[model samples]
Every structure is written in structure tokens, then in C-alpha cells.
Target: APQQINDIVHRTITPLIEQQKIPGMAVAVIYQGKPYYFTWGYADIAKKQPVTQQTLFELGSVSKTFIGVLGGDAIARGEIKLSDPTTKYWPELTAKQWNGITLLHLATYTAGGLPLQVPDELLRFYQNWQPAWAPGTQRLYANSSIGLFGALAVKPSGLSFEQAMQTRVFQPLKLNHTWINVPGVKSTIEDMARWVQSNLKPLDINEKTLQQGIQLAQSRYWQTGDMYQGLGWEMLDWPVNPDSIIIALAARPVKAITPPTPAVRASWVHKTGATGGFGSYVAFIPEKELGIVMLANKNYPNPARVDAAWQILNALQ
Candidate 1:
């Protein structure tokens, strides 16, 4: 039953609370088609309010998957194609020597050796933006990559990013409470409990696009200097091995762009995000018919947070 799960929750998260004096956190697991949830701490520490299903927290890059899936849907509908060069929209890069880097490369975070982040100044960011390696050859991993995609992916459809996002994802996915900021998105395992099931199944999204979005966002793209990268998802080599798992774990908040040893199909998919005061982790094994979503109010280091999730999921039924 929950004996194993409960024991580890006490053994692991309890100490985190004591040590970090964390404001609050929530954890949910989808097992055998049912969503099981748990939480600890305060949503507003000053108010002494306990965290519940209605609390809001920042998801950071976890939000990228939303962008990837929406853009994938657009690609499926012929609104955009991976082959479309970045110059198609943002003319600023029309002659920037992109070496033909496409939306696919940006979504996959392999934008010709771009840095881990886009500089805050946008007025002249691309003045010297040039590839450090051949397009699709080296992955530097950064948010500006997808941020650029968001800036331009909806133009062909004649909709702004917000309009496209509403029509394409939030509305279709029923994410009525999900927002675009650390403090705006009011979500909890209680909210995501059923949402996770929809991925395992589908609601009302266009069937073909839904399939395409899922496939495109998760498909193994060009290999990296590190993990098996997808649009935003980190694909874990199934028949999990130590080196690969270690490598997979390291490819965090962490790249390559080549085909490797005929790889094993992925079985585990995981992603993490962090903002000033929030941290999140979502992981799942479709083959095992199970997954977990964890969120914390105060920011936690990626490794320690992921380790707690690994421990909980590894704990029991």
C-alpha cells in the first residue's frame, strides 16, 4: 500500500523541511491511472497559511515544454515547419550567419553553441550572435533559444503568443488555472493530478496535432555532448545503466548534437525548473504507467530536489 511511500516521505522530505525551513512543497504521483497526492509546509509562511491545491509557484523552464508542445501542434497543422529558418520571422537575424539554425534546433536547445541564457539586453543581443559550431552540431542549452521560438512561432498563424497559447494549449489542455509567471500560475498536484492522466490519454485536442505535439516534443533529436535531448524533454535510455543514468542526471539545468551508438529507446522522461523562489520537477515512465510532479515554494538546488524525487519514486507503490 502506501507504507513504502509514507516511510520515504518521512525519511526524506521531513528533513528537508527541518533543514531548509522551507515554506511549503507538494508532491503527486500518478499510478495505475489514479492520482495520489501529498504536501507539506506553508503557502504563505508569514500568514501561517498551509499549502493546499490552490497555491501558486513558479515553474521556470518547466514552462518550456508547454511552448514546445504548442509549437509542435502548430508544426503538425502546417502553420510552421522545423525546416523554417529563424530568419523567416525575426529579420534581425536574417543575415546574422545562423548557419541555417532552424526552430527545431532552438526548441531542442542546440542553437549552434548559443550560451546557457540570452543576455537581458535585447536591443543589440544579436549584433555579434554567430554560431560557435555548425548548426545542430553543438548544443549550448539556453532559454533564449525557445524564447526566440515563442517570439516568432505564432506569427504565421496571425496570432500573438498569448492568443496562440490560449487557443492551442491552455484551452485545449484545460489548464485554466495555469499562468505564465512564477506568481501567476496557480497550480498544485491537486490541479495537475488529472492533467497528468490526459498525457497518458487525451482530452479534446486535435488528434493528429496531439499526437504530433507529443511525438515532436519527446522524439530523440540530434545527440548532444550530454543527455539524449528532445524539444525540452530529457530522454532517459531505457534498460537504465549507471553511466547513462549519471550522464542523464548531469545533463541538467545542463549538451551534444550527434547520433551515437544505436541507442536504446527511452523509458524515463524528466524535466526541472527553478526561479528566484520556486523549484519544480516533473518525471514519468509511460511504460510503467506512472509519474510524479513535485513543486516547492522556496528554491532548492536541482540535484538535491531531484534526488528527493528519485528517492520517493524509487520507494514504493
Candidate 2:
């Protein structure tokens, strides 16, 4: 059933594209295994090149999902264990407190009180920066911490982080156009849609691998009942409208945005990524099997992709 969601999305998104003066945008909706794709604007604004389904934009944090997949795959192959401490792989990581932090904790963003940003000088400190709280005691997002996990993936795979990602994740998914190294991708929009289709496909991680990836991405890993963060994904729960069947408020906050409000708390799962000039996001309701992914070239304060995707989701509902 091709719900008239496409019509509703077009009505709202066309205006946003013009108002924001965004150069290029790509969105894809997956419902019950059917995919509806939309492309607007140009991949290269200066040349006015039309965007298409094959455009390859930087996925940003969405790349983390690839990392997660690789990690899970490695676990399935018996190359690594999630319970292993960070110190096992990166023997240089010697902060006694952090020594207790397991690979699972890092994947789940529960390493404890690590700063989001670390200066060049602080990089050395990170080698020894231990966790403030006990492992799994709290949830605080940290890119440096996650990067370490990515690095760990690199070590056991006998390939660089980017290379392992390509061989293991991209190759299997047949995401021929996706790349972690930014310069390699000239087409941004289409490739992202392809990537989303691959990611949304149900994964076949084993019991151990499933537990590791889920704990990293879902709230179930934390002591708190809130499912706010994931290993490389963001979790959201939104509220429904009382008078109508539509959802009234949706919230998705990623690395670059503020947390969602109580009113919209239960509505969405949002995640954004920023690497240089690229910014991207993917949001959806897993229960409905409905979701959208957006990839952009220009940087922040540019509304996160979730903002636009959520609008599309609501219009569809």
C-alpha cells in the first residue's frame, strides 16, 4: 500500500528546501519493506547538478551504525568479545578507573563522564582518563570514547577502521557508493538512500552479538529505564495525540542538538552526524516500520535531518 505519505512529505519539504536555501537533500521512506525516495535540489550547488538516488553524501554518525554492524559481525566470527575491557585492545589505555569499562560499555555510551570534546593537549589525557562513575552507572555520549571502539574494531580486523568498514559492512550490504573517507564520495544524496535501505534491513547478529549491539543502541543496557542513546544510534519515545490518531509531538536529539522536551519525549528516534561541512540524520518509528534518512552538505544550525524526516513521518501518518 503506497500510503499518500509521499504527497504529504512533498508539500512540507518543498517549502523547507526553498526557505532554508539548502543546496541538496535526499530522503527515503521504508514502510513494510517498500521504499519511497525523494530528491530535491543539487548535489553540486555551483554546477546546479540535480541530485539523484545514487548521490553519496557523508553519513556522519550514521557511519557509527556501520561500525556497530562490523563490531557485531566480528563478534559473530569469534574475533572479539564485548565483555573485554577497553584495555585489552588498546593496552595503552591505563587509567585504572577506565580499566573496568568494557567494550560493551563503550559501545553503549556508558563509559561515564568522559568529555564530549577533548583538546589536542587532552588527547594524551584521554589515554589515561578513567571513568568517573562505575561502568553502566550513567549514560553520557562521547565521540572520543566511541572512536576508541571504532579503533578497536580496526585492530582485530587487520584493516584500518575505514578499510574494515568497507570490506565487512559496505561490501556485504552492496553499498557500492558509501565511503567513510569523505573525499571518496562525490555523490552524496543517492548513496545515503542506498545505505539506509541496507541498514534498515533486519540484521542477523547472534545472541552474543545481538546483546552487544542492542545494549549499545537501546535503553535496555542502562540501569535507567530511559532508552535515550545507542552505541551509534539515538533512541526516542514520542507521545500520541489525544483527539486524533496522529502523533502530537516527536523528539529526536543527536550529538549536535539539545535533548527533546517532555511533551515530545516519546515520539522519535533521532541521530545526526557532523564531519566538516557534512551533516546528516535518520529517524523512524521501529514499531511502525516507518522511517526517513536525510543527508546534507552544509553544517550546523541547519536543522538536523530528523526535523525534516519527522515532518515527513507525521504527514504520512
- Candidate 2's C-alpha runs over 4 A off are 1-3, 121-123, 128-132, 182-188, 203-219, 223-226, 237-269, 274-278, 300-304
Worst 10 residues of 1 by lDDT: 246-255
TM-score: which candidate is best?
1
Model 1: lDDT of residue 197: 58
* Total clashing pairs for each candidate: 6, 14
- Candidate 1 local Cα displacement, residue 266, angstroms: 4.6
Q: Please list the residue runs of candidate 1 whose C-alpha ends up more than 4 Å from where it truly belongs after superposition.
A: 1-4, 181-186, 201-206, 239-266, 275-277
| Tens-digit per-residue lDDT, 1-317, candidate 2 | 36477676787678777766778888777665456778888888898987788776766556666666677667756778767988888776666676788887777666776655454554377765766666766666666667677778557768877777676666665667776772223324445554454444344323354334333343323323334554466555653321222111122222311221211224355566653245576666655656677766765443534456666776664
Candidate 1, pairs of clashing residues: 223-256, 224-256, 224-257, 225-255, 225-256, 226-255
What's the C-alpha lDDT at position 194 in model 2? 49
Roughly what TM-score does model 1 have, to 2 decimal places? 0.84
Please, what is the TM-score per model? 0.84, 0.76
lDDT of 1 by residue, 126-146 (tens): 647776666766556577677
Candidate 1 residue 36 C-alpha distance from true site, Å: 1.3
Once model 1 is optimally superposed onto the true structure by TM-score, how far is the C-alpha of residue 31 displaced, in angstroms?
0.9
